[PDB]
Design a protein around this motif. Structure first.
Motif, PDB file in Angstrom:
ATOM      1  N   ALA A  52      24.394  11.157  -7.134  1.00 16.13           N
ATOM      2  CA  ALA A  52      25.740  11.797  -6.537  1.00 16.13           C
ATOM      3  C   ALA A  52      26.723  10.970  -7.191  1.00 16.13           C
ATOM      4  CB  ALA A  52      25.641  10.900  -5.051  1.00 16.13           C
ATOM      5  N   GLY A  53      28.259  11.368  -6.624  1.00 19.80           N
ATOM      6  CA  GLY A  53      29.279  10.748  -7.047  1.00 19.80           C
ATOM      7  C   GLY A  53      29.319  10.776  -8.794  1.00 19.80           C
TER       8      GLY A  53
ATOM      9  N   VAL B   9      31.921   8.249  -3.015  1.00 21.00           N
ATOM     10  CA  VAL B   9      30.812   8.981  -3.654  1.00 21.00           C
ATOM     11  C   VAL B   9      31.425  10.527  -3.295  1.00 21.00           C
ATOM     12  CG1 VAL B   9      28.625   9.815  -3.125  1.00 21.00           C
ATOM     13  CG2 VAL B   9      29.090   7.608  -2.613  1.00 21.00           C
ATOM     14  N   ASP B  10      31.872  11.110  -4.658  1.00 24.51           N
ATOM     15  CA  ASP B  10      32.378  12.367  -4.557  1.00 24.51           C
ATOM     16  C   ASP B  10      31.805  13.189  -5.974  1.00 24.51           C
ATOM     17  OD1 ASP B  10      35.933  13.848  -4.103  1.00 24.51           O
ATOM     18  OD2 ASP B  10      33.777  14.921  -4.384  1.00 24.51           O
ATOM     19  N   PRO B  11      30.994  14.046  -5.779  1.00 26.33           N
ATOM     20  CA  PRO B  11      30.442  14.799  -4.857  1.00 26.33           C
ATOM     21  C   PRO B  11      29.162  14.036  -4.064  1.00 26.33           C
ATOM     22  CG  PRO B  11      29.414  15.579  -6.827  1.00 26.33           C
ATOM     23  CD  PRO B  11      30.515  14.648  -6.997  1.00 26.33           C
ATOM     24  N   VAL B  12      29.387  13.895  -2.663  1.00 25.41           N
ATOM     25  CA  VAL B  12      28.065  13.744  -2.150  1.00 25.41           C
ATOM     26  C   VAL B  12      26.955  14.853  -2.185  1.00 25.41           C
ATOM     27  CG1 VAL B  12      26.778  13.234   0.122  1.00 25.41           C
ATOM     28  CG2 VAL B  12      29.091  12.326  -0.267  1.00 25.41           C
ATOM     29  N   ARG B  20      33.409  14.238   0.141  1.00 21.90           N
ATOM     30  CA  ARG B  20      33.791  13.063  -0.312  1.00 21.90           C
ATOM     31  C   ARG B  20      33.681  11.895   0.724  1.00 21.90           C
ATOM     32  NH1 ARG B  20      37.425  11.530  -4.338  1.00 21.90           N
ATOM     33  NH2 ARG B  20      38.700   9.774  -4.067  1.00 21.90           N
ATOM     34  N   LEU B 519      24.255   6.974   0.783  1.00 23.50           N
ATOM     35  CA  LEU B 519      23.602   8.446   1.304  1.00 23.50           C
ATOM     36  C   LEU B 519      22.661   8.339   2.338  1.00 23.50           C
ATOM     37  CD1 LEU B 519      23.210   9.246  -2.566  1.00 23.50           C
ATOM     38  CD2 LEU B 519      25.077   9.978  -1.099  1.00 23.50           C
TER      39      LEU B 519
END
Ligand code: SF4
Ligand code: SF4
Ligand code: F3S
Ligand SMILES: [Mg+2]
Lengths: 267, 534
Positions: A52-53, B9-12, B20, B519
């Motif tokens: 992710a991220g 966190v981007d992308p989740v 985001r 997450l």
């Protein structure tokens, strides 16, 4: 994330509902595990990837810059109004992302009517200025193979990828850039209710005995006669398709169908 | 030694759609959170002026993960606006397709979206398959042998030795991670079942296509009922029943035992991710016009006060825009809703999302499995009570444990188990009705020139409502208020953190570069941003 061996796929999500991604999970013979472990290397896919991220962005960069090359599969329309700001990933607009990545791909497949033709968010009045991939990126020379439908039959995606990996070329394409091997016939010419159409036997309503007996759905709006897809032949989920469930085709593999085929219950 | 600063966190990933998450952490714990949804499509704007019968075809494309659910909500909404009472069989068939949607959706969520937050797939390569088979056979009535699990390990070893990790590239567990706790054997069992679930979900989705034409995006609903006369036939019913029975077996013998084994290993997750207030709309009606006729009933709970469940008043919903990218600051009831995009970039003028912020009596409400399960429990639902008690007893925790990221994850499994069994009861009632000689599936109706309607679905992520104002026979206003809008929308004009934002406060973060704890909590709500924003 991939080097030699399996061909690398970079799967992007623009303005989309994820129904096209879900359709690929319905892949049958081969199933999606075969596809991900044996046929291909799925090197970026926001719905199922572990990272992710920042780690996901680094996974994307590693895949796109690989000297082995990659194929791009793109889901969703690209929002172009207001300089692309209606859709961003990692704070980059989807227009910027696709403009930088898709010209580097060895081949691009636009998967679903949103990526092929603009789709649901491009229906009037199109507040986000959504466009299909080839329309949006014409000026960069991108020419995506278009596999239309909302969502398409996943048989058509796997068959196009297999053809490309075997022949190192796209299959024959129609004037909408769709493979003729899947989109060369109207839904209607393949339909089991065609004898009723020919006989002028139309259901007048969904509650009618004529609908119960499986009469043609044209008067109830069916767009089978103006829609190119292989639905009656392949079916969906190995078991059914809209007219066999008693509902008209809504024209979902055609450009601008949201506005061209509506009202859905009229012809 | 712990981190202070921001994390983004981007992308989740491993959600539907574009999210985001931003947090501020102090000394290793999250102190503040923002839920930023970064795609807008504007389906409510697109619907204006169109034929109300077309709405379900557009709104189903709100989301292909929770496919069908919005076609059902729009059809219930227009059914309601026109005043048609659909036939009993249309209610059964719509309810059976929805039950099948829940099983598909929650299985895929637990294995394919959530589990990589807790399972180190590469550690499965270190496992002893004989020991793992023993453990798998002790938690389920299904017997698993060492050879069964070695086949999975062998396939995984060929995959990893290729150097092309694909969807596992840069996973937070690679190389080890202090917040990943499973032993190799349990990682192998979960990995085996992740792979199995990739094929089982094909059958769970096919069940929806037997009556509903295709998955994704079914095509069998109309105003007044359903279209699928073939669904009355013994052969289509047998086909559905066989797919249902195999899906239920997987829920009961694979998913729930794995959920309990992973929950048991992560019991510290009872301490994070709680929320205060809960809303649910009920689902699976006997009467389309009475929510209290549903197998799960609607209800509202504030501040975890489950002894005082409040009735659901649909007029106490307002959707805020003060911290969203829409014009102005005025919250609106959806029959007076407005969708007027105005982007100000991240935190411009204190706005940071394309989701509106729904509030009930001014409060932020969690919806979804934890709300459905807790409220039905507190209403004395005997199936929900039996399964939830058995889960708590197996985990050795009290009821308070449910107010957490672990508890929400557990509630998703509870609701799957309960719905899997209830699908067989609905199927038998449907069969019995056909055998009484009722073969009617659609009723006639007339379009009014002016009307208000609302349709309610409790979808896999919670309370879904579609709201129409018909003017001149056309859509004058159409508003969707979707479960993930409730749960993951931003702050309101009273600056109240939304459920996901509030639930993040207190989250420990062991490694800010690999913030799997964020997450875990975000994924426990099963976000869907296409749903939330539309
Ligand atoms: S083509 Fe249809 S199913 Fe695919 S992303 Fe677009 S709206 Fe969803
Ligand atoms: S039901 Fe539709 S596709 Fe079939 S014969 Fe009639 S118009 Fe053609
Ligand atoms: S609605 Fe679409 S799925 Fe086939 S039957 Fe018509 S092209
Ligand atoms: Mg809305």
């Amino acid at each position: 994330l991939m080097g030699p061996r399996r061909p690398s796929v970079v799967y992007l999500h623009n303005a989309e509902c994820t129904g096209c991604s879900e359709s690929v999970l319905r892949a049958f013979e081969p199933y999606i595990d075969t596809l991900i472990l044996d046929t291909l290397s799925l090197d970026y896919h926001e719905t199922i990837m572990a990272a992710a991220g920042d780690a996901a962005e680094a996974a994307l960069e590693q895949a796109v810059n690989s000297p082995h090359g990659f194929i791009a599969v793109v889901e969703g329309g690209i929002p172009t109004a207001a300089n692309g700001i209606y859709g961003k990933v990692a704070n980059h607009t989807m227009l910027d992302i696709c403009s930088r990545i898709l010209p580097k791909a060895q081949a691009v497949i636009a998967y679903g009517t949103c990526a092929t033709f603009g789709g649901v968010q491009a229906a009037k009045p199109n507040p986000t200025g959504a466009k299909g991939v080839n329309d949006a990126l014409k000026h960069l020379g991108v020419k995506a193979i278009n596999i239309a439908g909302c969502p398409p039959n996943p048989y058509n995606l796997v068959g196009t990828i297999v053809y490309y990996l075997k022949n190192k070329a796209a299959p024959e394409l129609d004037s909408l850039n769709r493979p003729t091997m899947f989109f060369g016939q109207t839904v209607h010419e393949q339909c089991p209710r065609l004898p009723h159409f020919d006989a002028g036997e139309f259901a007048p309503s969904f509650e009618s005995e004529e609908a119960r007996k499986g009469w043609c759905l044209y008067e109830l709006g069916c767009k089978g006669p103006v829609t190119m897809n292989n639905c009656p032949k392949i079916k969906f989920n190995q078991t059914n398709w809209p007219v066999d469930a008693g509902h008209p085709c809504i024209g979902c593999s055609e450009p601008d169908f949201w506005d061209a085929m509506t009202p859905f219950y009229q012809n | 030694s712990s981190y202070s600063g921001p994390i983004v966190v981007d992308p989740v990933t491993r959600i539907e759609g574009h999210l985001r998450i931003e947090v501020e952490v102090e000394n290793g714990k999250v102190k503040n959170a923002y839920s930023s949804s970064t795609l807008f499509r504007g389906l409510e704007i697109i619907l204006k002026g169109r034929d109300p019968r077309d709405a379900q075809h557009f709104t189903q494309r709100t989301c292909g993960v929770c496919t069908y659910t919005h076609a059902l909500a729009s059809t219930r909404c227009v059914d309601n606006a026109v005043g048609v009472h659909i036939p009993k069989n249309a209610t059964y068939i719509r309810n059976l397709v929805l039950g099948a949607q829940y099983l598909h959706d929650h299985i895929v969520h637990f294995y394919h979206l959530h589990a990589l937050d807790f399972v180190d797939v590469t550690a499965a390569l270190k496992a002893d398959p004989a020991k793992a088979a023993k453990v798998a056979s002790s938690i389920s009535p299904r017997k698993t042998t060492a050879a069964d699990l070695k086949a999975v390990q062998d396939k995984l070893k060929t995959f990893v030795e290729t150097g092309q990790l694909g969807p596992f590239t840069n996973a937070y567990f690679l190389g080890g991670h202090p917040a990943y706790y499973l032993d190799p054997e349990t990682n192998l069992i979960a990995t085996a079942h992740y792979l199995e679930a990739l094929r089982l979900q094909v059958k769970a989705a096919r069940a929806m296509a037997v009556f509903g034409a295709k998955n994704p995006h079914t095509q069998f609903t109309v105003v007044g009922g359903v279209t699928c006369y073939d669904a009355l036939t013994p052969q289509r019913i047998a086909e559905f029943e066989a797919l249902w029975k195999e899906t239920k077996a997987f829920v009961d013998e694979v998913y729930i035992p794995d959920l309990l084994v992973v929950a048991a290993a992560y019991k510290d997750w009872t301490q994070y991710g709680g929320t205060d207030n809960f809303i649910t709309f009920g689902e699976f009606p006997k009467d389309e016009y009475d929510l209290n006729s549903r197998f799960f009933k609607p209800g509202v709970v504030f501040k975890r006060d489950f002894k005082n469940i409040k009735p659901f008043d649909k007029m106490q919903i307002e959707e805020h825009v003060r911290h969203s990218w829409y014009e102005g600051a005025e919250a609106r009831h959806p029959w007076k809703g407005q969708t007027q995009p105005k982007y100000t970039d991240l935190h411009g003028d204190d706005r940071y999302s394309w989701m509106k912020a729904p509030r009930y009596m001014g409060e932020p409400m969690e919806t979804g499995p934890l709300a459905q399960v807790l409220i039905a429990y507190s209403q004395g639902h005997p199936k929900v009570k039996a399964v939830t008690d058995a889960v708590l007893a197996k985990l050795g925790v009290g009821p308070e444990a449910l107010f957490s990221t672990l508890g929400r994850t557990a509630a998703r499994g509870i609701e799957t188990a309960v719905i899997a069994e209830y699908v067989g009861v609905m199927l038998q009632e449907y069969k019995d009705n056909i055998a009484k000689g009722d073969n009617v599936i659609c009723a006639p109706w007339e379009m009014p020139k002016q009307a208000e309607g609302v349709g309610f679905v409790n979808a896999p992520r919670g309370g879904l409502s579609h709201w129409i104002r018909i003017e001149d026979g056309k859509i004058g206003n159409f508003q969707l208020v979707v479960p993930s809008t409730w749960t993951l929308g931003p702050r309101c004009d009273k600056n109240k953190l939304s459920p996901v934002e509030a639930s993040l406060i207190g989250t420990p973060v062991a490694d800010a570069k690999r913030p799997v704890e964020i997450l875990r909590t975000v994924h426990s709500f099963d976000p869907c941003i296409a749903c939330g924003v539309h």
